[PDB]
Write an enzyme that holds these catalytic residues in place. Sequence first.
Site: not given
Ligand code: ROL
Ligand code: MG
Ligand code: ZN
Length: 330
Positions: A79, A83, A119, A237, A240, A288, A291
């Site tokens: 962060h 980012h 943000h 946001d 990724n 992942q 996620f």
């Molecule tokens: C590239 O991965 C990730 C990228 C971003 C986030 C969050 C989304 N919003 C945020 O502020 C951070 C989590 C991720 O992976 C999660 C699964 C395993 C750890 C956290």
């Molecule tokens: Mg945030």
């Molecule tokens: Zn962010």
Amino acid sequence: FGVKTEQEDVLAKELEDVNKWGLHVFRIAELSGNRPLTVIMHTIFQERDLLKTFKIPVDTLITYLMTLEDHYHADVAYHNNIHAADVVQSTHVLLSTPALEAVFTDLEILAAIFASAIHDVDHPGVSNQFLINTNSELALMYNDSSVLENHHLAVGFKLLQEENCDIFQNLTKKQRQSLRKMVIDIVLATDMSKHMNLLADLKTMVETKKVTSSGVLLLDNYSDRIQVLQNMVHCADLSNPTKPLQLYRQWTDRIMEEFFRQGDRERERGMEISPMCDKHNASVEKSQVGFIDYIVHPLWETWADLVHPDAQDILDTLEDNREWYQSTIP
Ligand SMILES: COc1ccc([C@@H]2CNC(=O)C2)cc1OC1CCCC1
Ligand SMILES: [Mg+2]
Ligand SMILES: [Zn+2]
């Protein structure tokens, strides 16, 4: 001299991909002397003619951008300003999707991009819950409610008051009140606690989706317009996993580093270690995949529907990356 240095030229050449998903944002960070947010924001403002439209003095914009970027923490692995620059640039691309052509006003565009830039500003690299559990002054001020998200906004706006930083100095009070409301609405919607309702409402909009004779979405009222902007920046946001794997994996390394560091702090302090913050009990790849399956794919699938077929490649990439992580689970 009046001609770019060779590094500045190499940077300019990388910035030619500013309108493309998968910009080499980490190379830009390096090439710019750790000013990815400043250089990307400046490029986008010029490209979108925002300086002329909002009568933003160029020195004021650069001073503000450097100040903002300076208030992202260099020691925070995820962060940080890279980012932020990524989210700005991703929002910039999403804004220019065919399905949204001529939908948003210049002020709404300004809101989405400014919101993206600020943000996560002054993010300490720990979660709201960590701040709440430690009885931090921040959590005290914000009544344990969207603590960081409220803070990012407050800092983003406060920094406008530093010397020659008021980039909105020439906006009318009406423009400023509107801009401010939109920015707040967008950044508060980045709290992951809001994800499910944000997605539910996006789905409802896709269900009732209306499109013009020109073929673009129709958004009549503020509620629909801001909902699309909130979801757009939220998608940025959470973008990724939709990027080229070379980029995505760098983001995973970073979020895991930030998470494991929080976990180490929790362990040190005798607190329960937060989910996925235990470096001794981690499943990076499984996490992942989860996620993606439970958060990112559901969101992006719905976005891809809203703007069909604009986001098909992004979604294909997400699914390719999902399968790669799945295949790597030991
Ligand atoms: C590239 O991965 C990730 C990228 C971003 C986030 C969050 C989304 N919003 C945020 O502020 C951070 C989590 C991720 O992976 C999660 C699964 C395993 C750890 C956290
Ligand atoms: Mg945030
Ligand atoms: Zn962010």
